Coordinates of C-alpha atoms in Angstrom, one line a residue:
Chain A
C1 CA 20.8 44.1 -5.4
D2 CA 23.3 46.2 -5.3
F3 CA 21.1 49.2 -6.5
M4 CA 19.4 48.0 -3.3
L5 CA 21.3 48.8 -0.8
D6 CA 23.3 51.1 -2.4
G7 CA 20.6 52.7 -5.1
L8 CA 17.5 52.9 -2.9
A9 CA 16.0 54.9 -0.2
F10 CA 15.5 52.7 3.5
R11 CA 11.4 52.7 2.4
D12 CA 12.0 52.4 -0.9
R13 CA 14.3 48.8 -1.1
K14 CA 11.5 47.9 2.2
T15 CA 8.8 47.8 -0.4
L16 CA 10.8 46.2 -3.0
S17 CA 11.9 43.7 -0.8
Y18 CA 8.3 43.0 1.0
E19 CA 8.0 42.1 -2.8
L20 CA 10.7 40.3 -4.4
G21 CA 13.1 38.9 -2.5
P22 CA 10.6 35.7 -1.2
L23 CA 10.8 35.4 -5.3
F24 CA 14.2 37.0 -5.6
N25 CA 14.8 33.9 -2.7
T26 CA 13.6 31.4 -4.9
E27 CA 15.0 32.2 -8.4
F28 CA 18.5 33.0 -7.2
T29 CA 18.1 29.2 -5.3
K30 CA 16.9 27.6 -8.0
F31 CA 19.4 29.1 -10.1
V32 CA 22.7 28.2 -7.7
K33 CA 20.3 24.6 -7.6
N34 CA 20.8 23.8 -11.1
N35 CA 23.6 25.1 -12.1
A36 CA 25.4 23.5 -9.1
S37 CA 27.7 21.6 -11.5
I38 CA 29.4 24.7 -12.8
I39 CA 29.9 26.9 -9.6
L40 CA 31.5 23.9 -7.4
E41 CA 33.8 23.2 -10.4
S42 CA 36.4 25.1 -8.9
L43 CA 37.2 25.7 -5.1
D44 CA 38.2 29.5 -5.6
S45 CA 36.1 30.8 -8.0
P46 CA 35.6 34.3 -9.1
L47 CA 31.9 32.9 -9.6
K48 CA 32.2 31.3 -6.2
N49 CA 33.4 34.9 -3.9
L50 CA 30.6 36.8 -5.8
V51 CA 27.7 34.4 -5.2
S52 CA 29.0 35.2 -2.0
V53 CA 28.5 37.8 -2.3
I54 CA 25.3 37.9 -3.7
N55 CA 24.6 36.1 -0.6
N56 CA 26.1 37.8 2.0
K57 CA 24.6 41.0 0.5
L58 CA 20.3 38.7 0.3
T59 CA 21.2 38.6 3.8
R60 CA 22.3 42.6 4.3
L61 CA 19.2 43.1 2.9
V62 CA 16.5 41.5 4.6
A63 CA 18.4 43.0 8.1
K64 CA 18.2 46.2 6.3
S65 CA 15.2 46.2 5.1
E66 CA 13.7 44.6 7.5
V67 CA 11.4 42.2 6.1
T68 CA 9.8 39.4 8.0
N69 CA 7.1 38.5 5.6
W70 CA 10.6 35.9 3.5
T71 CA 13.3 35.0 5.2
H72 CA 16.6 34.6 3.9
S73 CA 19.0 33.1 6.3
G74 CA 21.8 32.5 3.3
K75 CA 22.7 29.0 5.2
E76 CA 21.7 27.4 2.7
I77 CA 24.2 29.0 -0.3
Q78 CA 26.7 28.6 2.2
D79 CA 26.4 25.2 2.7
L80 CA 26.1 23.9 -0.4
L81 CA 29.0 26.7 -1.6
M82 CA 30.4 24.9 1.4
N83 CA 29.5 21.5 -0.1
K84 CA 32.8 21.2 -2.2
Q85 CA 33.4 17.5 -0.2
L86 CA 30.6 15.8 -1.5
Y87 CA 31.2 16.8 -5.9
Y88 CA 29.2 13.7 -6.9
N89 CA 26.8 13.1 -4.6
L90 CA 24.6 16.5 -6.5
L91 CA 25.8 14.9 -9.5
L92 CA 24.3 11.4 -8.6
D93 CA 21.1 12.9 -8.0
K94 CA 21.0 14.4 -10.9
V95 CA 21.5 10.7 -12.6
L96 CA 19.0 10.2 -10.2
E97 CA 16.6 12.5 -11.9
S98 CA 17.7 11.8 -15.1
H99 CA 16.2 8.3 -14.2
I100 CA 13.4 8.8 -12.4
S101 CA 13.1 11.6 -15.8
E102 CA 13.7 8.4 -17.7
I103 CA 10.2 5.8 -16.0
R104 CA 7.6 8.2 -16.0
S105 CA 7.6 9.2 -19.4
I106 CA 8.2 5.5 -19.4
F107 CA 4.8 5.4 -18.3
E108 CA 3.9 8.0 -20.3
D109 CA 3.7 6.5 -23.1
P110 CA 0.5 7.7 -24.8
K111 CA 0.7 3.5 -27.3
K112 CA 0.9 1.6 -23.2
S113 CA 3.0 -1.0 -26.1
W114 CA 4.5 -1.6 -21.8
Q115 CA 1.5 -2.6 -21.1
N116 CA 1.9 -5.2 -23.6
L117 CA 2.6 -8.1 -20.9
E118 CA 4.1 -11.4 -22.8
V119 CA 4.2 -14.4 -21.6
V120 CA 7.8 -15.5 -19.6
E121 CA 7.9 -19.2 -18.3
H122 CA 3.6 -19.0 -17.4
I123 CA 3.6 -15.8 -16.3
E124 CA 2.7 -13.3 -18.6
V125 CA 5.0 -10.6 -17.3
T126 CA 4.7 -6.6 -18.7
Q127 CA 7.9 -4.7 -20.8
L128 CA 8.2 -2.6 -17.7
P129 CA 11.0 -5.2 -15.9
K130 CA 13.1 -4.1 -18.5
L131 CA 12.9 -1.3 -18.5
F132 CA 13.5 -0.9 -15.5
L133 CA 17.0 -3.3 -15.8
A134 CA 18.0 -1.1 -18.5
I135 CA 17.5 1.6 -15.7
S136 CA 19.1 -0.1 -12.6
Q137 CA 21.7 -0.5 -15.6
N138 CA 22.3 2.8 -16.5
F139 CA 22.3 3.7 -12.4
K140 CA 25.2 1.0 -11.8
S141 CA 27.2 2.4 -14.8
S142 CA 26.6 5.9 -13.7
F143 CA 28.1 4.7 -9.6
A144 CA 30.8 3.8 -12.1
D145 CA 33.4 6.8 -12.2
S146 CA 31.5 8.4 -9.5
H147 CA 33.7 8.6 -5.9
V148 CA 29.6 8.7 -4.3
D149 CA 29.8 7.0 -0.4
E150 CA 28.2 3.4 -0.7
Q151 CA 26.6 4.3 1.9
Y152 CA 24.7 7.0 0.0
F153 CA 23.7 4.7 -3.4
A154 CA 21.9 1.7 -1.0
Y155 CA 19.6 4.3 -0.8
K156 CA 19.5 6.5 -3.3
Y157 CA 18.8 3.0 -5.3
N158 CA 16.0 1.6 -2.3
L159 CA 14.6 5.1 -2.9
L160 CA 14.9 4.9 -6.7
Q161 CA 12.6 0.7 -5.9
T162 CA 9.8 2.5 -4.1
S163 CA 9.2 5.5 -6.0
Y164 CA 9.1 2.7 -9.1
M165 CA 7.1 0.4 -8.1
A166 CA 4.7 3.3 -6.2
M167 CA 4.4 4.3 -9.6
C168 CA 3.6 0.8 -11.0
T169 CA 1.3 0.4 -9.0
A170 CA -0.5 3.4 -9.1
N171 CA 0.0 2.4 -12.4
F172 CA -0.9 -0.9 -11.1
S173 CA -4.6 0.1 -9.6
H174 CA -6.4 -2.9 -10.9
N175 CA -3.9 -4.9 -11.9
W176 CA -2.0 -5.4 -9.7
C177 CA -1.5 -9.3 -9.1
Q178 CA 0.3 -8.6 -13.1
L179 CA 2.8 -6.2 -11.0
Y180 CA 3.0 -8.5 -8.0
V181 CA 4.2 -11.4 -10.9
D182 CA 5.8 -9.6 -12.3
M183 CA 8.1 -8.2 -9.9
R184 CA 8.2 -11.8 -9.2
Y185 CA 9.8 -12.3 -12.0
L186 CA 12.3 -8.9 -12.0
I187 CA 13.0 -10.7 -8.0
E188 CA 14.2 -14.0 -10.2
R189 CA 15.9 -12.1 -12.8
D190 CA 17.9 -10.0 -10.3
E191 CA 18.1 -11.1 -6.4
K192 CA 19.8 -7.7 -5.8
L193 CA 16.6 -6.0 -4.9
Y194 CA 15.8 -6.4 -1.9
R195 CA 14.2 -3.7 -1.6
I196 CA 11.8 -4.6 -4.9
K197 CA 11.5 -8.3 -3.0
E198 CA 9.9 -6.6 0.5
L199 CA 7.9 -3.7 -1.2
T200 CA 6.2 -6.0 -3.1
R201 CA 5.5 -9.3 -0.3
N202 CA 4.4 -5.8 1.7
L203 CA 1.5 -4.7 -0.6
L204 CA 0.9 -8.3 -1.3
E205 CA 0.7 -8.7 2.3
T206 CA -2.0 -5.9 2.3
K207 CA -4.1 -7.0 -1.0
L208 CA -4.1 -10.2 1.0
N209 CA -5.3 -8.3 4.4
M210 CA -7.3 -6.2 2.8
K211 CA -9.6 -8.4 1.2
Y212 CA -9.6 -10.1 4.8
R213 CA -10.7 -7.6 6.2
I214 CA -13.5 -7.0 3.4
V215 CA -14.1 -10.6 3.8
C216 CA -13.7 -10.9 7.8
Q217 CA -16.4 -7.9 8.0
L218 CA -18.2 -9.0 4.9
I219 CA -18.8 -13.0 7.5
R220 CA -19.0 -10.8 11.0
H221 CA -21.9 -9.7 9.1
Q222 CA -23.8 -12.4 7.6
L223 CA -22.9 -13.9 11.3
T224 CA -25.2 -10.8 13.0
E225 CA -27.6 -11.5 10.6
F226 CA -27.9 -15.1 11.9
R227 CA -27.1 -14.3 15.4
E228 CA -30.3 -12.1 15.1
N229 CA -32.7 -13.5 12.5
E230 CA -32.8 -16.8 12.3
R231 CA -35.5 -17.2 9.7
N232 CA -33.6 -15.5 6.3
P233 CA -30.6 -16.1 6.8
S234 CA -29.9 -13.9 3.1
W235 CA -27.0 -15.8 1.5
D236 CA -26.8 -12.6 -0.7
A237 CA -23.4 -11.7 1.2
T238 CA -22.5 -14.9 0.3
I239 CA -23.7 -15.8 -2.8
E240 CA -23.2 -13.4 -5.1
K241 CA -21.0 -11.0 -2.8
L242 CA -18.7 -13.1 -1.1
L243 CA -18.1 -16.2 -3.4
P244 CA -17.6 -14.6 -6.4
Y245 CA -15.6 -11.8 -4.2
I246 CA -13.5 -14.8 -2.9
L247 CA -13.3 -16.4 -6.6
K248 CA -12.9 -13.4 -9.3
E249 CA -11.0 -11.4 -6.9
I250 CA -8.8 -14.1 -4.9
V251 CA -8.8 -17.2 -6.3
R252 CA -8.7 -16.4 -9.6
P253 CA -5.6 -13.7 -9.0
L254 CA -3.7 -15.8 -6.8
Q255 CA -3.8 -18.7 -9.2
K256 CA -3.3 -15.5 -11.6
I257 CA -0.2 -16.0 -9.4
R258 CA 1.2 -19.5 -11.0
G259 CA 3.4 -20.4 -8.9
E260 CA 4.7 -21.9 -5.3
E261 CA 4.3 -17.9 -3.6
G262 CA 0.2 -17.9 -5.4
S263 CA -0.3 -21.9 -4.2
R264 CA 1.0 -21.3 -0.8
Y265 CA -1.0 -17.7 -0.8
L266 CA -3.8 -19.5 -1.8
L267 CA -3.2 -22.1 1.0
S268 CA -3.2 -19.8 4.0
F269 CA -6.1 -17.7 2.4
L270 CA -8.8 -20.5 2.2
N271 CA -6.6 -21.5 6.2
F272 CA -8.1 -17.2 6.6
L273 CA -11.2 -18.3 5.2
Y274 CA -12.3 -21.7 6.4
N275 CA -9.8 -21.4 10.2
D276 CA -10.4 -18.2 10.8
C277 CA -13.6 -16.4 9.1
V278 CA -15.4 -19.2 9.6
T279 CA -14.3 -22.0 12.0
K280 CA -13.2 -19.9 14.3
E281 CA -15.5 -17.7 14.0
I282 CA -18.4 -20.0 14.3
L283 CA -16.7 -21.2 17.6
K284 CA -17.3 -18.2 19.3
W285 CA -20.6 -18.1 18.5
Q286 CA -22.6 -19.0 22.3
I287 CA -25.2 -20.3 21.6
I288 CA -26.5 -22.7 17.9
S289 CA -30.0 -23.4 17.2
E290 CA -31.6 -25.8 15.1
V291 CA -33.0 -23.1 12.5
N292 CA -29.2 -21.6 13.1
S293 CA -27.4 -24.9 12.8
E294 CA -29.6 -25.8 9.7
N295 CA -28.3 -22.2 8.4
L296 CA -24.7 -22.9 9.0
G297 CA -25.0 -26.5 7.6
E298 CA -25.5 -24.4 4.3
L299 CA -24.1 -21.5 4.4
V300 CA -20.2 -24.7 5.2
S301 CA -21.8 -26.6 2.7
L302 CA -21.7 -24.4 -0.5
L303 CA -19.3 -22.9 1.1
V304 CA -16.7 -26.2 1.0
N305 CA -19.2 -26.6 -3.2
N306 CA -18.6 -23.1 -3.8
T307 CA -14.8 -22.8 -2.9
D308 CA -13.3 -25.7 -4.2
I309 CA -9.6 -24.7 -5.7
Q310 CA -8.8 -28.6 -8.3
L311 CA -5.5 -27.1 -8.0
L312 CA -4.6 -27.0 -5.2
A313 CA -7.0 -30.6 -4.8
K314 CA -3.5 -32.5 -4.1
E315 CA -2.5 -30.2 -1.8
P316 CA -2.6 -32.8 1.6
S317 CA -3.6 -29.7 4.1
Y318 CA -5.7 -28.7 1.4
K319 CA -7.9 -31.3 1.7
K320 CA -7.4 -31.7 5.3
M321 CA -8.9 -28.4 5.8
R322 CA -12.2 -28.7 3.4
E323 CA -13.0 -32.0 5.0
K324 CA -12.8 -30.3 8.0
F325 CA -15.2 -27.9 7.0
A326 CA -17.4 -30.0 5.3
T327 CA -17.9 -32.1 8.0
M328 CA -18.4 -29.3 9.8
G329 CA -21.6 -28.6 8.1
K330 CA -22.6 -32.3 8.1
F331 CA -22.2 -32.3 11.9
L332 CA -23.9 -29.0 12.6
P333 CA -27.0 -29.5 12.1
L334 CA -27.3 -33.4 13.6
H335 CA -28.1 -35.1 16.5
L336 CA -25.5 -35.9 19.2
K337 CA -26.6 -39.9 18.5
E338 CA -24.9 -39.0 14.7
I339 CA -21.7 -36.9 15.9
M340 CA -20.5 -39.8 18.1
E341 CA -21.5 -42.8 15.3
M342 CA -19.4 -40.9 12.7
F343 CA -17.1 -39.8 15.9
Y344 CA -17.1 -43.7 15.6
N345 CA -15.8 -43.9 12.4
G346 CA -13.1 -41.5 13.0
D347 CA -14.7 -38.8 10.3
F348 CA -13.5 -36.0 13.6
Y349 CA -9.6 -37.0 13.3
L350 CA -9.3 -33.0 11.6
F351 CA -11.1 -31.7 14.6
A352 CA -9.7 -31.0 18.0
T353 CA -10.9 -32.3 21.2
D354 CA -11.5 -29.9 22.4
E355 CA -13.1 -28.1 19.2
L356 CA -15.5 -31.4 19.5
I357 CA -16.9 -30.5 23.0
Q358 CA -17.1 -27.5 22.3
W359 CA -19.1 -27.3 19.2
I360 CA -21.0 -29.6 20.8
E361 CA -21.6 -27.7 24.2
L362 CA -22.5 -25.1 22.0
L363 CA -25.0 -27.3 19.6
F364 CA -26.1 -29.5 22.3
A365 CA -28.1 -28.2 25.4
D366 CA -26.9 -29.4 29.5
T367 CA -27.7 -33.1 28.9
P368 CA -26.6 -36.5 31.0
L369 CA -26.5 -37.7 26.9
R370 CA -24.3 -35.5 26.0
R371 CA -22.1 -35.3 28.7
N372 CA -21.4 -39.0 28.0
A373 CA -21.0 -38.3 24.3
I374 CA -17.9 -36.1 25.7
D375 CA -16.6 -38.5 27.9
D376 CA -16.1 -40.6 25.4
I377 CA -14.6 -38.5 23.4
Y378 CA -12.3 -37.8 25.5
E379 CA -11.4 -40.6 26.9
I380 CA -11.2 -41.9 23.0
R381 CA -9.0 -39.2 22.2
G382 CA -7.1 -40.2 25.6
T383 CA -6.6 -43.4 24.6
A384 CA -5.4 -42.9 21.4
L385 CA -2.5 -41.1 22.5
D386 CA -0.9 -43.7 25.0
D387 CA 0.1 -45.9 22.2
Chain B
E1 CA -11.1 26.3 -13.4
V2 CA -8.6 23.5 -12.0
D3 CA -6.4 26.7 -10.4
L4 CA -10.1 27.2 -8.7
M5 CA -11.2 23.7 -8.1
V6 CA -7.1 22.9 -6.2
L7 CA -7.9 26.7 -4.4
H8 CA -10.8 25.0 -3.0
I9 CA -9.3 22.0 -2.0
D10 CA -6.9 24.0 0.2
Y11 CA -9.2 25.9 1.7
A12 CA -11.0 22.2 2.6
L13 CA -8.0 21.2 4.1
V14 CA -8.2 24.6 5.6
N15 CA -11.6 23.0 7.1
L16 CA -10.3 19.9 6.9
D17 CA -12.8 17.8 4.6
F18 CA -10.4 15.5 2.9
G19 CA -13.6 13.8 1.7
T20 CA -14.8 17.1 -0.6
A21 CA -11.2 18.0 -1.1
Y22 CA -10.3 14.4 -2.5
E23 CA -13.6 14.1 -4.3
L24 CA -12.3 17.7 -6.4
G25 CA -8.9 16.1 -6.7
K26 CA -10.8 12.7 -8.6
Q27 CA -11.8 15.5 -10.1
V28 CA -9.5 17.6 -11.4
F29 CA -7.1 14.6 -11.9
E30 CA -9.9 12.9 -14.3
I31 CA -10.7 16.2 -15.6
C32 CA -6.4 16.7 -16.5
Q33 CA -6.4 12.9 -18.0
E34 CA -8.3 13.9 -20.9
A35 CA -7.3 17.4 -20.7
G36 CA -3.5 16.7 -22.2
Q37 CA 0.2 16.7 -21.6
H38 CA 0.4 20.4 -20.7
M39 CA -2.3 20.9 -18.3
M40 CA -0.8 17.8 -16.4
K41 CA 2.6 19.4 -16.6
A42 CA 1.1 23.0 -15.3
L43 CA -0.3 21.1 -12.8
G44 CA 2.3 19.4 -11.6
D45 CA 4.9 22.7 -11.7
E46 CA 1.6 25.6 -10.2
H47 CA 0.6 22.9 -7.5
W48 CA 2.2 20.1 -6.4
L49 CA 3.3 21.6 -3.9
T50 CA -0.3 21.9 -2.0
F51 CA -1.1 18.1 -3.1
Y52 CA 1.9 17.6 -1.4
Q53 CA 1.0 19.5 1.7
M54 CA -2.5 17.1 1.6
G55 CA -1.1 13.9 1.1
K56 CA 0.6 15.0 4.3
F57 CA -2.7 16.0 5.9
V58 CA -3.7 14.9 9.4
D59 CA -6.3 14.9 11.2
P60 CA -5.9 15.7 15.1
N61 CA -9.2 14.5 15.7
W62 CA -8.3 11.5 14.9
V63 CA -8.8 8.6 17.1
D64 CA -5.5 8.0 19.3
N65 CA -3.9 10.5 16.7
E66 CA -4.2 7.7 14.4
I67 CA -4.8 7.5 10.9
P68 CA -7.2 5.8 9.4
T69 CA -6.7 2.5 7.7
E70 CA -9.9 3.8 4.9
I71 CA -7.6 7.3 4.4
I72 CA -3.8 5.4 4.9
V73 CA -4.3 3.7 1.2
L74 CA -6.5 7.3 0.6
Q75 CA -3.5 9.1 1.0
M76 CA -1.3 5.8 -0.2
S77 CA -2.8 6.2 -3.4
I78 CA -3.2 10.2 -3.8
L79 CA 0.9 10.2 -3.5
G80 CA 1.3 7.3 -6.0
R81 CA -0.5 9.2 -8.9
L82 CA 0.8 12.5 -7.3
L83 CA 4.1 10.7 -7.8
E84 CA 3.9 10.1 -11.3
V85 CA 3.6 13.9 -12.6
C86 CA 5.5 15.6 -9.7
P87 CA 8.2 17.7 -10.8
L88 CA 11.3 15.3 -10.3
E89 CA 12.7 17.7 -7.4
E90 CA 10.5 16.2 -4.6
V91 CA 10.8 12.6 -5.4
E92 CA 11.7 11.6 -2.1
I93 CA 10.5 13.1 0.5
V94 CA 6.8 11.9 -1.5
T95 CA 8.5 8.3 -1.5
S96 CA 9.9 8.4 2.0
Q97 CA 6.2 9.4 3.1
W98 CA 4.3 7.0 0.7
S99 CA 7.3 4.9 3.0
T100 CA 6.3 6.3 6.0
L101 CA 2.1 5.2 5.2
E102 CA 2.9 1.9 4.1
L103 CA 5.1 0.6 7.1
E104 CA 2.7 2.2 9.1
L105 CA 0.3 0.5 6.7
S106 CA 2.5 -2.3 7.7
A107 CA 2.0 -2.4 11.5
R108 CA -1.8 -2.3 12.1
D109 CA -4.5 -5.1 13.3
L110 CA -6.0 -5.7 10.2
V111 CA -9.3 -8.2 11.2
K112 CA -9.7 -5.8 14.0
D113 CA -9.5 -1.8 13.4
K114 CA -9.0 0.1 15.7
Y115 CA -9.0 3.3 12.6
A116 CA -11.8 1.5 10.3

């Protein structure tokens, strides 16, 4: 830089700056950075003096050279030189770099021995939980005699958690539920991983909402087919697309979760499927023809018949919803007298009064028999609430 | 070849061809994944800035200037794969961007998606 300033001509300096001042900036910057330890080791040192000289001189180079293609405010060097009050944030960041390089190399294993999943109470969990635990050990150990503020450690620790989980999800594009159960096991091993728990719940909600989008879109497409076509309901979307996707992308993974969370998300899933995907969607219909009622009855029939989860058979909510749905698929193609008399038997104990009235109105047209049926059901449900 | 292709991805971002861009990204990623570790490091130290730029692509023509959930998960997976081999000093920002997407991802109506 001395030879730049005091050794070159104006045009010479100008050209040579134009050419290398970008490289000058980046290389000197990265050097100072990598060597931040020894330079900020002391408060006043001919190293820091000299490097501030170099920064001022490079700024004067940008100035005298009058270059625009590259700029060097030097403000960054000024700040890092003034970055004497932390002295640990740099060390903590180097520790972060070590730990992230460690976790990266962890995924860089060609033998994939970490992918070897071990059944622990019964959940198959890879070896990655242990390595992440060890890296957290090493990091909390690094913070032991670091004078870093306890407000930057939490941010950087959650950053580790987030980065690591993102790494794993990238490495768990298809076995995401295995990742979910491994991190649930980690949470059970360490509850202080709140970033981890929130993120894994968020990505689980993400995947379930994604398949929920898929299934509700596919259901709305099937209902579009039903409203458009009355002859061939085209069960193809149901039999070979919807039911297998549900079993082997939802039912089987959610069972693989194998816990209260697994059963609970199964139960929420079949809420969303029975009620939201179908019950709410069918109730949104304007009119249902006899052939359309038969098609919905068949659909509902092979759904309850194709979506039975014996794991949740003991769940009263599961039994109630599946019975409500099966009795839906029953009463869809039946006549009003059958509806009324099986309501007299009490089979509609799972159906809301208004939902039942809407069902009868959507199925049966404007007839005085329907009015008798609706008033009978209304006043039966009215005397059933005075006791 | 990867260099030409990432150039193409760059200029396609200049052209807003996120589709073709991501296709070439698939291509080059799989190319290097069966190329080798040295190639990972080389592409990383050479074009992580490119990958970051394009993992932070935003289309001005997006409905309500909102990123499509498909494009959300696309860039999400993109950043996820990138994070694995990108240089250390960047892990923060991408991750932030990741969370930047994730929070946004956790803030949409999925059944009736205005951006689908």
